[PDB]
Amino acid sequence: MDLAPQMLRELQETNAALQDVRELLRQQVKEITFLKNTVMECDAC
Amino acid sequence: MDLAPQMLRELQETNAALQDVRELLRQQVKEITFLKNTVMECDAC
Amino acid sequence: MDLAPQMLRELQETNAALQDVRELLRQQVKEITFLKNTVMECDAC
Amino acid sequence: MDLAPQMLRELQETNAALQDVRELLRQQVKEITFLKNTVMECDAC
Amino acid sequence: MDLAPQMLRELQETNAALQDVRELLRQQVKEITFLKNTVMECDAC
Ligand SMILES: C=C1CC[C@H](O)C/C1=C/C=C1\CCC[C@]2(C)[C@@H]([C@H](C)CCCC(C)(C)O)CC[C@@H]12
Ligand SMILES: C=C1CC[C@H](O)C/C1=C/C=C1\CCC[C@]2(C)[C@@H]([C@H](C)CCCC(C)(C)O)CC[C@@H]12
């Protein structure tokens, strides 16, 4: 058999998954940042 | 020995692990977002 | 020389590191969740 | 080179995506560390 | 043979970045765990 076609599909799937991770990570950084700023302006601190 | 069969298996394992990482990241962003909001409504702040 | 063997080795090392990442992230979510619950019970909030 | 060219392009895209993830994680750690300090140094605690 | 030299190079760069990510995550969970303990002991809570 020729496994090249399947290997290419696996690599493409890896990039698809990586794009999802990157998207999630950038949103996560935004949430943590909001949380940080909120704690900084917390009068009780 | 042709190594394509083994390489394909490695690629498949990579994607399976990525699937898990993506799922964990999704659940994590949810917890953080919940924490963010919980703090924005903290009495002593 | 044939680089196929070395390519397979790189893929195997990648999966090892990715496995460690999966485990670390799994523990991290638990820590964040515990953190979330602790804040939800913070009397000052 | 049959599918070789396409496979190399996928690998290049993966490395680029990884670089971004790495940069995002670097920023996230500083935010979390800045938060860890802000708390460790909160009066009411 | 094949674009093997080029593909191997991309795989080596990917591993280098992944090892860095692993180390970043390791340090990050440490900081989060520290944050968790600090809150658990926050008398204001
Ligand atoms: C970035 C992220 C998002 C990802 C991780 O879960 C870690 C994290 C935590 C935010 C937290 C954790 C516990 C302590 C914090 C910093 C709260 C303070 C303890 C509130 C001080 C309250 C007081 C005023 C009465 O003494 C506000 C937000 C809380
Ligand atoms: C920053 C953080 C730390 C905080 C969150 O957990 C999210 C995160 C993830 C890092 C990851 C997740 C899955 C995908 C990545 C980006 C790996 C790649 C899939 C490896 C491509 C491998 C290959 C070689 C076969 O083509 C390397 C590091 C991995």
Write the layout of secondary structure elements.
Five copies of one chain form a homopentamer.
Chain A: H1 4-40
The structure holds ligand VDY (2 copies).
Describe the structure.
5 copies of one chain form a homopentamer. In chain A, 82% of the residues lie in helices and 0% in strands. Chain A contains 1 helix and no strands. The first copy, chain A, has one domain (1-45): Single alpha-helices involved in coiled-coils or other helix-helix interfaces (Up-down Bundle). With 45 residues, chain A is mainly alpha-helical. Chain A starts with a helix and ends in a 5-residue tail after the last helix. Chains in contact: A-B, A-D, B-C, C-E, D-E. The interface between C and E is medium-sized, with 28 and 26 residues. One copy of the ligand C=C1CC[C@H](O)C/C1=C/C=C1\CCC[C@]2(C)[C@@H]([C@H](C)CCCC(C)(C)O)CC[C@@H]12 sits between chains A (32, 35, 39, 42, 44-45) and D (32, 35, 39, 42, 44-45). Chains A, B, C, D, E: This is Cartilage oligomeric matrix protein. Chains A, B, C, D, E: It comes from Mus musculus. Chains A, B, C, D, E: Belongs to the thrombospondin family. Chains A, B, C, D, E: Residues 2-45 are annotated as: COMP N-terminal. Chains A, B, C, D, E: It is found in: Secreted, Extracellular space, Extracellular matrix.
